[PDB]
Design a binder for this molecule. Sequence first.
Ligand SMILES: CCN(CC)c1ccc(-c2nc3ccccc3c(=O)[nH]2)cc1
Ligand SMILES: [Zn+2]
Lengths: 47, 161
Amino acid sequence: MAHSPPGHHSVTGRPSVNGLALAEYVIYRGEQAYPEYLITYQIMRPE
Amino acid sequence: GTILIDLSPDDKEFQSVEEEMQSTVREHRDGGHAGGIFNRYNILKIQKVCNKKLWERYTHRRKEVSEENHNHANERMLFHGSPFVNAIIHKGFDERHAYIGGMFGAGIYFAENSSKSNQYVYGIGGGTGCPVHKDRSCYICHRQLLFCRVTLGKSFLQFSA
Ligand SMILES: CCN(CC)c1ccc(-c2nc3ccccc3c(=O)[nH]2)cc1
Ligand SMILES: [Zn+2]
């Protein structure tokens, strides 16, 4: 992996075009995330 | 050393995780190409991932980050989709789980929108879709996402399209 920008622990991707999109985030150390829930699902066909 | 504990649908914890999953679906600019066409999910199961060593690895780093950031870990709960979800829950996140070609460089990516993470369940751009039917919009096959505790610390803000 790359390094975090100097003086930072992560990157936040803020959307600047799509007004409905929420943020995305990047960490560069696996130790900064814990997989707390495993969710099993299907997508549903609209109607 | 991972065990998975099923949550009952009657459990408040199941219900709050399902609500975060359902309420953060959005439409995507690819018209559903990568993740499929849908407005909601059928939640089949929610399991707590329990691993003492991996948890202590997380909290150790969280304390390091918090001490570098005026006692503020800036901890979030975020979605992660990946072909390697079953490896992650057993071995923990590491460099093998990074999106090498991501727009913010080679790191491990998380989303507030569950539907964003859903685009990566079968690989980058949805890969070739589900292994059984080769369908990125498969309504039959069972998918898995992780809902993860993530330490952001001081985060670099990138404004981006
Ligand atoms: C390490 C495996 N890999 C290549 C198939 C991979 C690529 C991307 C992702 C991924 N990227 C995202 C990008 C933005 C927001 C969320 C995600 C995400 O959940 N997973 C996960 C794993
Ligand atoms: Zn399928």
